[PDB]
Design a protein around this motif. Sequence first.
Motif, PDB file in Angstrom:
ATOM      1  N   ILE A  77      43.849  77.484  63.682  1.00  0.00           N
ATOM      2  CA  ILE A  77      44.192  77.499  65.089  1.00  0.00           C
ATOM      3  C   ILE A  77      43.235  76.629  65.870  1.00  0.00           C
ATOM      4  CG2 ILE A  77      42.839  79.568  65.612  1.00  0.00           C
ATOM      5  CD1 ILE A  77      45.367  80.440  67.350  1.00  0.00           C
ATOM      6  N   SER A  78      43.783  75.982  66.889  1.00  0.00           N
ATOM      7  CA  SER A  78      43.006  75.188  67.822  1.00  0.00           C
ATOM      8  C   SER A  78      43.350  75.682  69.206  1.00  0.00           C
ATOM      9  CB  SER A  78      43.373  73.709  67.713  1.00  0.00           C
ATOM     10  OG  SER A  78      43.113  73.213  66.414  1.00  0.00           O
ATOM     11  N   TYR A  79      42.331  75.965  70.002  1.00  0.00           N
ATOM     12  CA  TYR A  79      42.533  76.502  71.337  1.00  0.00           C
ATOM     13  C   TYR A  79      42.418  75.428  72.414  1.00  0.00           C
ATOM     14  CZ  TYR A  79      42.058  80.993  69.008  1.00  0.00           C
ATOM     15  OH  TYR A  79      42.196  82.063  68.166  1.00  0.00           O
ATOM     16  N   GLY A  80      42.907  75.755  73.605  1.00  0.00           N
ATOM     17  CA  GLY A  80      42.934  74.822  74.718  1.00  0.00           C
ATOM     18  C   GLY A  80      41.585  74.239  75.087  1.00  0.00           C
ATOM     19  N   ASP A  81      40.520  74.987  74.822  1.00  0.00           N
ATOM     20  CA  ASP A  81      39.173  74.548  75.167  1.00  0.00           C
ATOM     21  C   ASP A  81      38.525  73.719  74.056  1.00  0.00           C
ATOM     22  OD1 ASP A  81      38.547  76.406  73.241  1.00  0.00           O
ATOM     23  OD2 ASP A  81      37.297  77.664  74.535  1.00  0.00           O
ATOM     24  N   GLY A  82      39.281  73.425  73.002  1.00  0.00           N
ATOM     25  CA  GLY A  82      38.799  72.568  71.935  1.00  0.00           C
ATOM     26  C   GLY A  82      38.168  73.302  70.769  1.00  0.00           C
ATOM     27  N   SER A  83      38.038  74.618  70.884  1.00  0.00           N
ATOM     28  CA  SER A  83      37.477  75.401  69.790  1.00  0.00           C
ATOM     29  C   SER A  83      38.540  75.634  68.717  1.00  0.00           C
ATOM     30  CB  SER A  83      36.927  76.735  70.292  1.00  0.00           C
ATOM     31  OG  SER A  83      37.951  77.570  70.790  1.00  0.00           O
ATOM     32  N   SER A  84      38.112  76.068  67.536  1.00  0.00           N
ATOM     33  CA  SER A  84      39.022  76.248  66.416  1.00  0.00           C
ATOM     34  C   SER A  84      38.440  77.170  65.359  1.00  0.00           C
ATOM     35  CB  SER A  84      39.347  74.896  65.786  1.00  0.00           C
ATOM     36  OG  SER A  84      38.177  74.289  65.261  1.00  0.00           O
ATOM     37  N   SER A  85      39.321  77.658  64.494  1.00  0.00           N
ATOM     38  CA  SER A  85      38.921  78.469  63.363  1.00  0.00           C
ATOM     39  C   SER A  85      40.046  78.476  62.335  1.00  0.00           C
ATOM     40  CB  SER A  85      38.576  79.885  63.824  1.00  0.00           C
ATOM     41  OG  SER A  85      39.636  80.434  64.585  1.00  0.00           O
ATOM     42  N   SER A  86      39.725  78.862  61.104  1.00  0.00           N
ATOM     43  CA  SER A  86      40.711  78.870  60.032  1.00  0.00           C
ATOM     44  C   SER A  86      40.253  79.741  58.878  1.00  0.00           C
ATOM     45  CB  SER A  86      40.964  77.449  59.527  1.00  0.00           C
ATOM     46  OG  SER A  86      39.784  76.875  58.974  1.00  0.00           O
ATOM     47  N   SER A 108      41.075  86.343  58.261  1.00  0.00           N
ATOM     48  CA  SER A 108      39.658  86.253  57.947  1.00  0.00           C
ATOM     49  C   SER A 108      39.185  84.813  58.061  1.00  0.00           C
ATOM     50  CB  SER A 108      39.445  86.773  56.526  1.00  0.00           C
ATOM     51  OG  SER A 108      38.139  86.488  56.093  1.00  0.00           O
ATOM     52  N   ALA A 109      38.202  84.570  58.918  1.00  0.00           N
ATOM     53  CA  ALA A 109      37.729  83.203  59.102  1.00  0.00           C
ATOM     54  C   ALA A 109      36.852  82.736  57.949  1.00  0.00           C
ATOM     55  CB  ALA A 109      36.970  83.075  60.407  1.00  0.00           C
ATOM     56  N   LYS A 110      37.203  81.582  57.394  1.00  0.00           N
ATOM     57  CA  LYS A 110      36.306  80.866  56.498  1.00  0.00           C
ATOM     58  C   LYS A 110      35.472  79.865  57.287  1.00  0.00           C
ATOM     59  N   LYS A 111      36.047  79.324  58.360  1.00  0.00           N
ATOM     60  CA  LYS A 111      35.364  78.348  59.206  1.00  0.00           C
ATOM     61  C   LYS A 111      35.633  78.670  60.657  1.00  0.00           C
ATOM     62  N   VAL A 112      34.621  78.458  61.498  1.00  0.00           N
ATOM     63  CA  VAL A 112      34.759  78.590  62.942  1.00  0.00           C
ATOM     64  C   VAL A 112      34.015  77.425  63.578  1.00  0.00           C
ATOM     65  CG1 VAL A 112      34.902  81.131  62.841  1.00  0.00           C
ATOM     66  CG2 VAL A 112      32.704  80.060  63.350  1.00  0.00           C
ATOM     67  N   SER A 113      34.477  76.977  64.739  1.00  0.00           N
ATOM     68  CA  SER A 113      33.800  75.890  65.434  1.00  0.00           C
ATOM     69  C   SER A 113      32.550  76.400  66.148  1.00  0.00           C
ATOM     70  CB  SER A 113      34.741  75.190  66.420  1.00  0.00           C
ATOM     71  OG  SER A 113      35.144  76.056  67.463  1.00  0.00           O
ATOM     72  N   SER A 114      31.728  75.459  66.584  1.00  0.00           N
ATOM     73  CA  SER A 114      30.415  75.776  67.122  1.00  0.00           C
ATOM     74  C   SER A 114      30.440  76.744  68.311  1.00  0.00           C
ATOM     75  CB  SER A 114      29.697  74.482  67.509  1.00  0.00           C
ATOM     76  OG  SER A 114      30.428  73.751  68.484  1.00  0.00           O
ATOM     77  N   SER A 115      31.451  76.625  69.169  1.00  0.00           N
ATOM     78  CA  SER A 115      31.561  77.494  70.341  1.00  0.00           C
ATOM     79  C   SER A 115      31.619  78.958  69.920  1.00  0.00           C
ATOM     80  CB  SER A 115      32.820  77.155  71.135  1.00  0.00           C
ATOM     81  OG  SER A 115      33.067  78.134  72.127  1.00  0.00           O
ATOM     82  N   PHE A 116      32.296  79.231  68.812  1.00  0.00           N
ATOM     83  CA  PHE A 116      32.393  80.601  68.321  1.00  0.00           C
ATOM     84  C   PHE A 116      31.070  81.054  67.725  1.00  0.00           C
ATOM     85  CE2 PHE A 116      37.019  79.608  68.314  1.00  0.00           C
ATOM     86  CZ  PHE A 116      37.384  80.593  69.195  1.00  0.00           C
ATOM     87  N   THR A 117      30.467  80.210  66.895  1.00  0.00           N
ATOM     88  CA  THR A 117      29.188  80.539  66.289  1.00  0.00           C
ATOM     89  C   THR A 117      28.155  80.882  67.348  1.00  0.00           C
ATOM     90  OG1 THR A 117      29.583  79.094  64.385  1.00  0.00           O
ATOM     91  CG2 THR A 117      27.284  79.640  64.863  1.00  0.00           C
ATOM     92  N   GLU A 118      28.139  80.091  68.414  1.00  0.00           N
ATOM     93  CA  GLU A 118      27.130  80.199  69.461  1.00  0.00           C
ATOM     94  C   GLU A 118      27.337  81.417  70.354  1.00  0.00           C
ATOM     95  OE1 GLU A 118      26.685  75.310  69.551  1.00  0.00           O
ATOM     96  OE2 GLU A 118      27.686  76.372  71.196  1.00  0.00           O
TER      97      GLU A 118
END
Length: 330
Positions: A77-86, A108-118
């Motif tokens: 998934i990619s969100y409107g604010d540019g974040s993503s996960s999969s 279950s996320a294997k990968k998340v973008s930096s905005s989520f991590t932070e």
Amino acid sequence: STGSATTTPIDSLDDAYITPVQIGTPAQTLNLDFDTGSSDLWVFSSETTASEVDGQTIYTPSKSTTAKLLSGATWSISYGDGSSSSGDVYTDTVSVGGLTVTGQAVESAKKVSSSFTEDSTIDGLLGLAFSTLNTVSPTQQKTFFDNAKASLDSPVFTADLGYHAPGTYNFGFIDTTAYTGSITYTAVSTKQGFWEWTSTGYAVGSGTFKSTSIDGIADTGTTLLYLPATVVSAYWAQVSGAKSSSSVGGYVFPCSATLPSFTFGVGSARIVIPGDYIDFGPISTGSSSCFGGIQSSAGIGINIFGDVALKAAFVVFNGATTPTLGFASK
């Protein structure tokens, strides 16, 4: 059945709200961002790339006796604010505020973008838009609401977000003590998979109401109110020193300002957003330039009634055969 859960701002600006969700057996409680603008329930997990986890609570399917791998299923998934996960997908038991769904797809996320991590406070998302937007492949999955619907006393959920305070998500009933006056209902289009509706206009401060149709989405997962450039310009023109800054990425205003309210129409009814709700504070620590809570939707491609707007109302998401949205003052 019904459910009722408290939703809590993640920070002093109400940047997002988290709601505790029980997943698995025994329960694993994760704090999820309930998002009426998307349709995936995804979590930080024991499968998430370790370097991309920074303080979140994780779901560990191997510790849940009711978890089952949904074989072959993946999501992205990619969100409107540019974040993503999969990642990949399990089914498991999910409960919100006492309301339980068995066999819910838990992505279950294997990968998340930096905005989520932070963001250490958000353990995942719980999507509440229409299931047609769900990203699981090759077999699309249903949202928590869609799965719960048949068991609910009434096929509805409500969002009652607080301003700098906790609020409530209810499933299956309308709490008639939670709002003032009457609820005004308005038509929804599901053509884009969103809770999409048409506001009947706006006013700035004590100014006259402008009757004009504004198509947009009710989106609890978006912080701000994004409206057409004409409307936004008219708002900020009433704030001395306000300007649109390409460097900052939107309208900013002097932190010394007193902001006017913003009214939006729901049919013949009016929801008033107090000026303070539109203040998102210094652009950077110590700055005297403050970020505005009403921003242009130009180049988003859609108008978004995000938290700034929704927290001024008690909002009914009616998932009857013909869906509708209801707004009341509170």
